[PDB]
């Protein structure tokens, strides 16, 4: 799990949450097939609601210009972000995301390599509502400050606990990475961090260009696009 903070500033988050608080919400089951629909009991904006289209586009521009998201996710496709609200006991029980998610009836299709939640509500403003991620050998609970993003592989079973007080607004989306295998992405991420550290401490060292070549030749071997 990668926590990427402050995608939006505090004033931006306040503006976005105010619009979400005043939006006309629809039943969340519309974007789930008949299976995980049994587990989904929240509210969602329609995909092409103008607020969802506007903030989704704003999220994409921020993420494509975030060095941490670019390095760790190596994004190729970002599914148009969806917006949900858990309140009044709303929840999303344990489910796996579909391997391929269609956009506008299959115009674009996104392999769900990575999943993400961007929190638009303060953790003090709702009870429950934790994003619970279950791996093979353990569980992780995530409840981040408003404006922060969590990034985790699409291979995990996850759920959102019921919200028992207040309301939780967030955006969620999937990313198809250039690099499908998470162990390969993390290897590239760690190697890039090492190269960045060496560039600061000892720039102009001839081994840096060759290690950069190694990094990009790995990307050549592994990138699908």
Answer for which of 12, 125, 127, 135 binds a copy of itself (CB under 8 A) is 135
197 is in an annotated binding site: no
Residue 166: left if φ>0, alpha if ψ -120 to 50, beta else—which one?
left
Structural Rg of the chain based on CA atoms = 19
The CA dihedral of 174, 14, 90, 165, to the nearest 10 degrees, is 140
Is the backbone of residue 53 left (phi > 0), alpha (psi -120 to 50) or beta? alpha
Q: Is 95 annotated as a binding residue?
A: yes
Q: Distance between CA atoms of 47 and 103, rounded to whole angstroms?
A: 9
Name the 3-class secondary structure at 69.
helix
CB of 2 to a copy of itself, least distance (A): 5
Stretch that binds a copy of itself, among 10-18, 24-32, 84-92, 216-224 (CB under 8 A): 216-224
Q: Which sign, positive or negative, has the C-alpha torsion 177, 179, 184, 185?
A: negative
Please count the other Cβ atoms lying within 10 Å of the Cβ belonging to residue 17: 18
For a copy of itself, give the closer residue by CB, 18 or 64. Answer: 64
* Span near a copy of itself by CB under 8 A; candidates 47-55, 84-92, 162-170, 214-222: 214-222
Residues 6 or more apart from 87 whose CB is under 8 A from it?
Answer: 43, 126, 163, 166, 167, 168
Site string for a copy of itself, 150-189 (x = CB under 8 A): ----xx-x------------------x-x-xxxx--xx-x
Which one, 165 or 210, has the nearer CB to a copy of itself? Answer: 210
DSSP β-ladder status, 149-153 and 114-119: antiparallel
The yes or no reply on residue 1 touching a copy of itself (CB under 8 A) is yes
| Span near a copy of itself by CB under 8 A; candidates 48-56, 99-107, 121-129, 162-170 | 99-107
One of 100, 103, 139, 165 touching a copy of itself (CB under 8 A): 100
List of residues contacting a copy of itself (CB under 8 A) = 1-3, 35, 64, 72, 76, 94-100, 106, 109, 111-113, 135-138, 154-155, 157, 176, 178, 180-183, 186-187, 189-191, 193-195, 197-198, 201-202, 205-207, 209-214, 216-221, 223-225
């Amino acid at each position: 799990l990668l926590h990427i903070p402050a995608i939006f500033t505090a004033e931006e988050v306040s503006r976005i949450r105010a619009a979400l608080e005043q939006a006309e919400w629809a039943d969340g089951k519309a974007t789930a097939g008949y299976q995980s629909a049994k587990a989904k009991h929240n509210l969602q904006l329609p995909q092409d609601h103008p607020l969802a289209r506007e903030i989704g586009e704003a999220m994409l521009q921020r993420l494509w210009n975030h060095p941490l998201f670019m390095s760790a996710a190596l994004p190729l496709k970002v599914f148009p972000p969806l917006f949900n609200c858990y309140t009044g006991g709303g929840s999303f029980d344990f489910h796996i995301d579909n391997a391929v998610r269609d956009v506008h009836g299959g115009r674009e299709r996104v392999r769900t390599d990575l999943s993400s939640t961007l929190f638009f509500s303060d953790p003090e403003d709702y009870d429950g509502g934790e994003l619970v991620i279950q791996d093979t050998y353990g569980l992780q609970q995530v409840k981040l400050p408003a404006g922060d993003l969590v990034l985790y592989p699409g291979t995990s079973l996850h759920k959102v606990n019921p919200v028992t007080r207040g309301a939780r607004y967030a955006s969620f989306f999937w990313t198809q990475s250039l690099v499908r295998e998470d162990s390969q992405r993390t290897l590239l991420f760690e190697m890039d961090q090492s190269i960045q550290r060496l560039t600061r401490d000892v720039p102009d060292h001839p081994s840096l260009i060759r290690l950069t070549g190694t990094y990009h030749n790995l990307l050549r071997r592994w990138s699908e696009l």
